[PDB]
Design a protein around this ligand. Structure first.
Ligand SMILES: *[C@@H]1O[C@H](CO[C@@H]2O[C@@H](C)[C@@H](O)[C@@H](O)[C@@H]2O)[C@@H](O[C@@H]2O[C@H](CO)[C@@H](O[C@@H]3O[C@H](CO)[C@@H](O)[C@H](O)[C@@H]3O)[C@H](O)[C@H]2NC(C)=O)[C@H](O)[C@H]1NC(C)=O
Lengths: 216, 220, 210, 222, 196
């Protein structure tokens, strides 16, 4: 078994930057290293083979170097098309023991943007169906890291929430997040105050957006 | 078919020199690498020299400075010149054909597996001089009676029993080579003890180089 | 002392399979250097049976086979036949020696005629030779198969310059060997006990005179 | 062109049997090795195995040997991946890739790849989406949305005002609930002045259930 | 117009020695440098030509013969050698001008459970002429009684499979062999080394 370890796991870069990604092997794989590019919802594409040989249709800005245990893929001038996840794979071994790296995600660097926080109360039509969904939205925020907390009558909630995060927006290079709290109608009637507390680098203080079922 | 003939062997004194020649037929001699390999009497094979088609030469450390290898492609012959001969050099020397010569980009020793071997030439190196056999019989104690020869050079020696009438029961045991280069042999005859009381046994031993013929009587 | 070490003797009756081993060193086998196997019938020039560690030359029976593991290499003979009886040698290249190395050699006998054990008749020195002031002792070994033996000379229960003959084949097709080691001074009188020891198929036969 | 076309997406229940296909065009199918790669949800690529078509050589990855069968038909230039008994962990994307070839003592990676086939294995039977409004708040930019809940299987496609509204629209990735039913949210940012004067309708289509729902999202009335 | 040596050497699939492949190389410029620069090859032995200086000579035609054999049997692919592969599969001329090149292929041509696709001929009535191929499947009569289409004692199928396993030793491991034949005839030289 040969282990392929890729550094970094993630990087954020601007167009025109030089990007360097390293793949390391547990034992020597000689020249049989392959570099792949994959984009969300799309199949992997083979950029490089033999550690330095470019597949047809791959621009010269992509370059490959390295031997034995250590290999490196470099993009000389980063391009809008080049923001994607990149993988390294070994072909030295028998097909049985072929292995891939964990991959490096290349993302667009952006100035910090605070999340815009919105809370949507449960709809009455869903309440008739017997379930209550409360939604908190963090909109157009960079960086990706954000902490969302659901407080019901100022009581912390755990295990009742699910989160989804958007991929970076094409126009603005920001992320949007949705947190949904699913409760019973009976528990929804039981408690007055539903609050979403948001922590992000752009916000100096956590921002809480809340609604009172009784007050409104 | 392939014929390899070796010549030039003989009995020579230590510190002597001699030339061995191998004549090759039935194959293209120039293309083949050639080797010299020696086998001491009752002993294993030892590689002595190698000559390539190109003329690259490798020698064993034991023979270095005393033995040289040569080839003549017109005469299709291999030659080994031997100087400062020693008793350890005594052996049967074999002409050996190696693989077809090649140029190797890669490093490493040449391929040398010996498909073709000559019948060989025996080379004997000894400081010994001709010596008459000294005969001492071995007395009985069926009974076994025999005759012993000590410190004799060189073989052949012939032993006969009771003028040769007694053929059955008589074994001529192998000669031994001593550090001196002298040879010792025994001949043993097995016959009834009842015969021993009533039958005389006389052994006749002849050494032609010594020109000494002796008759020995063995009795209890 | 041979760089490649082989078993001295191997025995098998017809139709059996026997193995001959060539032990090695970091210099020769186990450096990857090839091993070649040669068969020599008595009184004949050596003949190539295996080359390139496994390849069999044309006209060499399929029963002969070659394999190598680590320092060691082995030749396998299957369906043993009387013609197969020979002395077998292994060849390799040694980097330290900068030359090709041969093994000491192995004697293989198809068992054929029944196994037999050495018969020994040690002889004390003759008085006429004693009158000569020399002393000679002859250990005579007869009618043994395989004809491969080890001879050790014992004086006064002590291990003992000794010279011993190569095994020889008698008319019976049994073998005979001879040891004539003879010391005149300071021990034949000193020792009133003497013996010669022969080992054959793990058996030691002793004849004592002094 | 060299084209690898994979079979359409598959949804199956646990313990069932599945065979998926990749058809090759523009190259000699017999000349090039063809293999299968699994991408588990939110995970990296894994090689399952390869097959050389027409010489009956199938080489499996260590991980997947004995759990899957890889086959090929040279007559239709197609390759197949088969699961004897489907399991929930088998749910993943599955890709067909052609190995470019070999050089010296080693292999080369896959130059050409298929579009991919999504295999979902679940106890859940197919269910239509329920669309619930995420109303704009009576608070200069306001957020409105639609919540699509309790639908199986994926995909669900969401539009706003029949494609007139694309700006400010984020349609979130679906999440899998303990029910085995997926839920998704689509939200759009609009001018606050717009809420009274503009009608915003979310159009949600689920092909598996043949379900289309258009939901008006309107400011709540107090 | 560089000679297409990569197609022979870097080919995904190699032929069995009984059905060995021959590719003509012609009307091209040959850089033998790729071959001598490489550290890839376990055997690079040239007969009648030096491994170096091939570029300075010009050859009317070049032939590349490719097959897969076990490593020890690379010793059989030489002028004047004898054995099953030389006698019944691929025979090199005594007057051979060309190069024999071989490299280990275990990761490429070995699989767990064995690869039995590569094959060799154990028996033939006569030893093969130089550069001759036999793809026959006829049963071989090694005995006095005719086979009559049935395998048995002294009646054998001509072909057998190498069993190539990663666990196997290097001598029994798969090795890929290219033999380059350089020919001189009374013709203008299609293949020339780059220097001349
Ligand atoms: C078989 O293929 C290898 C690998 O080459 C790559 O894969 C093939 C399938 C083709 O698509 C190639 O186009 C592709 O690059 C070939 O090995 C390569 O050979 C070249 C030339 O000898 C090497 O370049 C040289 O490197 C040396 C050392 O630095 C320099 O001195 C030279 O100036 C020159 O740059 C190259 O490094 C080497 N690559 C590898 C990974 O080994 C091989 O030549 C080919 N076989 C044949 C017969 O053509």
């Amino acid at each position: 078994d040969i282990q392929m370890t890729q550094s970094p796991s993630s990087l954020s870069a601007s167009v025109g930057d030089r990007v360097t990604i390293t793949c390391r092997a547990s034992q020597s794989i000689s020249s049989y290293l392959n570099w792949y590019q994959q984009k969300p919802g799309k199949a992997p594409k083979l950029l490089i083979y033999a550690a330095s040989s470019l597949q047809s249709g791959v621009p010269s800005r992509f370059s490959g170097s390295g031997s034995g245990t250590d290999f490196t893929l470099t993009i000389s001038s980063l391009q809008p098309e080049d923001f994607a996840t990149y993988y390294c794979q070994q072909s030295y071994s028998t097909p049985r023991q072929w292995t891939f790296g964990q991959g490096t995600k290349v993302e667009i660097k952006r100035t910090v943007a605070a999340p815009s926080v919105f809370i949507f109360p449960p709809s009455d039509e869903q309440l008739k169906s017997g379930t209550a969904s409360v939604v908190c939205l963090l909109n157009n925020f960079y960086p990706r890291e954000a902490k969302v907390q659901w407080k019901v009558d100022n009581a912390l909630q755990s295990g009742n929430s699910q989160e989804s995060v958007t991929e970076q927006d094409s126009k603005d290079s920001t992320y949007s997040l949705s947190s949904t709290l699913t409760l019973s109608k009976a528990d929804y009637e039981k408690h007055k105050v539903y609050a979403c507390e948001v922590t992000h680098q752009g916000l100096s203080s956590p921002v809480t957006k809340s609604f009172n079922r009784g007050e409104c | 078919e392939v014929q390899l003939v070796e010549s030039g062997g003989g009995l020579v004194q230590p510190g002597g020199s001699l030339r061995l020649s191998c004549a090759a037929s039935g194959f293209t001699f120039s293309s083949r690498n050639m080797n010299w390999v020696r086998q001491a009497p009752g002993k294993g094979l030892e590689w002595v020299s190698y000559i390539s088609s190109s003329g690259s030469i490798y020698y064993a450390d034991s023979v270095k400075g005393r033995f040289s290898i040569s080839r003549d492609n017109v005469k299709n012959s291999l030659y080994l010149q031997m100087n400062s001969l020693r008793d350890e050099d005594t052996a049967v020397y074999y002409c050996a054909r190696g693989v077809v010569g090649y140029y190797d980009m890669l490093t490493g020793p040449p391929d040398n597996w010996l498909d073709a071997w000559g019948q060989g030439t025996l080379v004997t190196v000894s400081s010994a001089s001709t010596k008459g056999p000294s005969v001492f019989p071995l007395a009985p104690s069926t009974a076994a009676l025999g005759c012993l020869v000590k410190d004799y050079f060189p073989e052949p020696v012939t032993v006969s029993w009771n003028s040769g009438a007694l053929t059955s029961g008589v074994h001529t045991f192998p000669a031994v080579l001593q550090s001196s280069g002298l040879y010792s042999l025994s001949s043993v005859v097995t016959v009834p003890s009842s015969s021993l009381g009533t039958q005389t046994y006389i052994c006749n031993v002849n050494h032609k180089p010594s020109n000494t013929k002796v008759d020995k009587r063995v009795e209890p | 002392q041979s760089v490649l070490t082989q078993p001295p003797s191997v025995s098998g009756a017809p139709g059996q399979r026997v193995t001959i081993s060539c032990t090695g060193s970091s210099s020769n086998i186990g450096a990857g250097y090839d091993v070649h196997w040669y068969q020599q019938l008595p009184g004949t020039a050596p003949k190539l049976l295996i080359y390139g560690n496994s390849n069999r030359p044309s006209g060499v029976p399929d029963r002969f086979s070659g394999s190598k593991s680590g320092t060691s290499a082995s030749l396998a003979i299957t369906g043993l036949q009387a013609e197969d009886e020979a002395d077998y040698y292994c060849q390799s290249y040694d980097s330290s020696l900068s030359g090709w190395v041969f093994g000491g050699g192995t004697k293989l006998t198809v068992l054929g005629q029944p196994k037999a054990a050495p018969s020994v008749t040690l002889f004390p020195p003759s008085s006429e030779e004693l009158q000569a002031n020399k002393a000679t002792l002859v250990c005579l070994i007869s009618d043994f198969y395989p004809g491969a033996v080890t001879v050790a000379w014992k004086a006064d229960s002590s291990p003992v310059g000794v010279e011993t003959t190569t095994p020889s084949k008698q008319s019976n097709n049994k073998y005979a060997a001879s040891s004539y080691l003879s010391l005149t001074p300071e021990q034949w009188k000193s020792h009133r006990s003497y013996s010669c020891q022969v080992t054959h198929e793990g058996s030691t036969v002793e004849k004592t005179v002094a | 062109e060299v084209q690898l076309v994979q079979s359409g997406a598959e949804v199956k229940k646990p313990g069932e049997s599945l065979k998926i296909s990749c058809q090759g065009s523009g190259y000699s199918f017999t000349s090039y090795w063809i293999g299968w790669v699994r991408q588990m949800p939110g995970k990296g690529l894994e090689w399952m195995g390869i097959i050389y078509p027409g010489e009956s050589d199938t080489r499996y990855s260590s991980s997947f040997q004995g759990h899957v069968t890889i086959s090929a038909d040279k007559s239709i230039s197609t390759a197949y991946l088969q699961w004897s008994s489907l399991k929930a962990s088998d749910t993943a994307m599955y890709y067909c890739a052609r190995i470019r070839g070999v050089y010296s003592s080693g292999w080369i990676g896959g130059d050409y790849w298929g579009q991919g086939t999504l295999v979902t294995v679940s106890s859940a039977s197919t269910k239509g989406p329920s669309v619930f409004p995420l109303a704009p708040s009576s608070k200069g930019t306001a957020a409105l949305g639609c919540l699509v809940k309790d639908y199986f299987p994926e995909p669900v496609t969401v539009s706003w005002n029949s494609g007139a509204l694309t700006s400010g629209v984020h349609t979130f990735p679906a999440v899998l609930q303990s029910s085995g039913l997926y839920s998704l949210s689509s939200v759009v940012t609009v001018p606050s002045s717009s809420l009274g004067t503009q009608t915003y309708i979310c159009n949600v289509n689920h092909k598996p259930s043949n379900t289309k729902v258009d939901k008006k999202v309107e400011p709540k009335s107090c | 117009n560089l000679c297409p040596f990569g197609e022979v050497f870097n080919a995904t699939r190699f032929a069995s020695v009984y059905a060995w492949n021959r590719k003509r190389i012609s009307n091209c410029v040959a850089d033998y440098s790729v071959l001598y620069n490489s550290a890839s090859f376990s055997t690079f032995k040239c007969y009648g030509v030096s491994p170096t200086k091939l570029n300075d000579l010009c050859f009317t035609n070049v032939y590349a013969d490719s097959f897969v054999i076990r490593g020890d049997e690379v010793r059989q692919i030489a002028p004047g050698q004898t054995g099953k592969i030389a006698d019944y599969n691929y025979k090199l001329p005594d007057d051979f001008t060309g190069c024999v090149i071989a490299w280990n292929s275990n990761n490429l041509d070995s699989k767990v459970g064995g690869n039995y696709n590569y094959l060799y001929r154990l028996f033939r009535k006569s030893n093969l002429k130089p550069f001759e191929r036999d793809i026959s499947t006829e049963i071989y009569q090694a005995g006095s009684t005719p086979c009559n289409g049935v395998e048995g004692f002294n009646c054998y199928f001509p072909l057998q499979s190498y069993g190539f396993q990663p666990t196997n030793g290097v001598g029994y491991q798969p090795y890929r062999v290219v033999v380059l034949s350089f020919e001189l005839l009374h013709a203008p030289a299609t293949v020339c080394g780059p220097k001349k």
